[PDB]
């Protein structure tokens, strides 16, 4: 499924062992601090955590081998969804997280017709709430529109 060539990934593995000094299978902005500093670039700690947490998928503030490699592959058409469901979650709750609450869902309701109350949201969440938490997680949303 749009997999990189063994030579491209293999070369990254060697560069990873030489570039990575933490001894972990992931990349950390600290390592970036030392490399960018060596090439004449010394960004502030804020830019380090920012640039690193944005380049890695999920944004844990570090780029794992698959996260960085996936971003490089993103240049080529990978999947039709392209994680577009994340954008749905980002709009459901400006908050900046991936969880839809009964109120936030009512906000998406606002986007269409129908006016709803705490009852109509608890019911809509009752359907997706497989966890029984009265809220809808990422897998629940895709369980509705994707139902994989």
């Amino acid at each position: 499924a749009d997999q990189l060539t063994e030579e491209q990934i293999a070369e990254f593995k060697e560069a990873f062992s030489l570039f990575d000094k933490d001894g972990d299978g992931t990349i950390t902005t600290k390592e970036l601090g030392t490399v960018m500093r060596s090439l004449g670039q010394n960004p502030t700690e804020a830019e380090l955590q920012d640039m690193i947490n944005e380049v890695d998928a999920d944004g844990n503030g570090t780029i794992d081998f698959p996260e960085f490699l996936t971003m490089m592959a993103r240049k080529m058409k990978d999947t039709d969804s392209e994680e577009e469901i994340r954008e749905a979650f980002r709009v459901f709750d400006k908050d900046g997280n991936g969880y839809i609450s009964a109120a936030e869902l009512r906000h998406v309701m606002t986007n269409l017709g129908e006016k709803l109350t705490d009852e109509e949201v608890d019911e809509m969440i009752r359907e997706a709430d497989i966890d029984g938490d009265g809220q809808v997680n990422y897998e629940e949303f895709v369980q509705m529109m994707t139902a994989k």
Partner: protein, 36 residues
Amino acid sequence: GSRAKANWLRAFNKVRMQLQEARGEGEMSKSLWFKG
């Protein structure tokens, strides 16, 4: 009843169509490093 069926449908679907709007936009998250 069925209040959630049509509304909720339009809900997750409301963002589903909205996801396309975000696509086709310039993103600088890659920043340096990715250039290599």
